[PDB]
Amino acid sequence: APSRNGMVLKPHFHKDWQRRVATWFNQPARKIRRRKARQAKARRIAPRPASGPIRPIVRCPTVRYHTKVRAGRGFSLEELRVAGIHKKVARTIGISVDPRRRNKSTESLQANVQRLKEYRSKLILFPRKPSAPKKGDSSAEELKLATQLTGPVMPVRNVYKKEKARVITEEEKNFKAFASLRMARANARLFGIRAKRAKEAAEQD
Amino acid sequence: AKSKNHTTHNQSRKWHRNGIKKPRSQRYESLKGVDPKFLRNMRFAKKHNKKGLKKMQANNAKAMSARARKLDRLAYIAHPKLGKRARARIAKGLRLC
């Protein structure tokens, strides 16, 4: 079968694929199902925003993506506890709750507490009975719009650094190096044996 | 299943369709397959052409450069450029009585 110069092609068509093929001609219909599903979700609720649970702020776990940031799933129980509010109180406020999430980094941890202080500043709620506890006055006709768009706070807003200008100094262009990667990379590979070779040097005696 | 085995009948006629193309001419013959010790002399000889000589050789070029009659007759009548006085006598020529 093969011939003059061409690439080896191995397609996966020995398996009788024509019985099992999903065809996307139902693609405009579901798209109109789903706008009319979100808009049916829009006019049920009330003043509360669609996509209304607020999400936390989470850095992306790898070496590849950890220089960007992402709306996670739920505020940490210990994050949310620094704001001081109880668990199932908080979901009625409209905050997402996640028990699985730790907090190793207080720069991460306090950044979400600032976000909850933001949202609880942001919040205009309504009571059942106007006994005036954590409630709102006649407030900007339900604050000028009932519903928000794509999260309440624009969760990405990925923060950039300027560090605008500086003079270059002595002893940085004198000392820094390529080689202080290579010296340190080779330092890490030999920490085990350099510990042991000197340990059996003094164990010899 | 008996067959014919080998024949160069009609192979002379196929080869000379496009023709026996002779490579024969090109310049600066390729420099692979050379005796390596010879090449381990010559690459060094090239790299000191550049570095070793400016002032000796270029000025040395500067020194040596500072050291340095009837049928013959009508063609001249009927030439395209050399005959306009040939017409001095048929056009505005001297002939007259």
Binding site: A1, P2, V63, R64, Y160, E163, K164, A165, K176, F178 | -
Partner: protein, 147 residues
């Protein structure tokens, strides 16, 4: 377009462009990659050299995920910033320099070419290469690692 074909030209002709004598049948030399080692070695070798055999160590659960470092060379190095800054780094000031960060644009390792801009710089990267690090020391610039 079935109106631009070869089929629509070849009607009226008998064998439809596949030969009386050889008779295009079904699958003469097998299906697919049949007989690579046996009767198609003059095709597989001389067109796909090295298709058969093994070379290396196995690596289980290879993620494309601990080897992620998009490179850059010193041609494109000025192209991350608006070139407003390289004018205002050439504005006769002092050894003040833009701190170009390649980690922002996505580039981890800075490889090298020749011919970098004369004006002094500070590059903040995760990885450097020593030819490129010889180039930034040429212009009097600096070389800062980020971790």
């Amino acid at each position: 377009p079935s109106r631009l074909r070869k089929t629509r030209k070849l009607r009226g002709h008998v064998s439809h462009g596949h030969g009386r004598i050889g008779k295009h049948r079904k699958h003469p030399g097998g299906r697919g990659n049949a007989g690579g080692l046996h009767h198609h070695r003059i095709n597989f070798d001389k067109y796909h050299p090295g298709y058969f055999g093994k070379v290396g160590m196995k690596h289980y659960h290879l993620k494309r995920n601990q080897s992620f470092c998009p490179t850059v060379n010193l041609d494109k190095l000025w192209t991350l910033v608006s070139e407003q800054t390289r004018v205002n780094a050439a504005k006769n000031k002092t050894g003040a320099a833009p701190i170009i960060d390649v980690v922002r644009s996505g580039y981890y390792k800075v490889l090298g070419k020749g011919k970098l801009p004369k004006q002094p710089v500070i590059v903040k990267a995760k990885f450097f290469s020593r030819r490129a690090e010889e180039k930034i020391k040429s212009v009097g610039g600096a070389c800062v690692l980020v971790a």
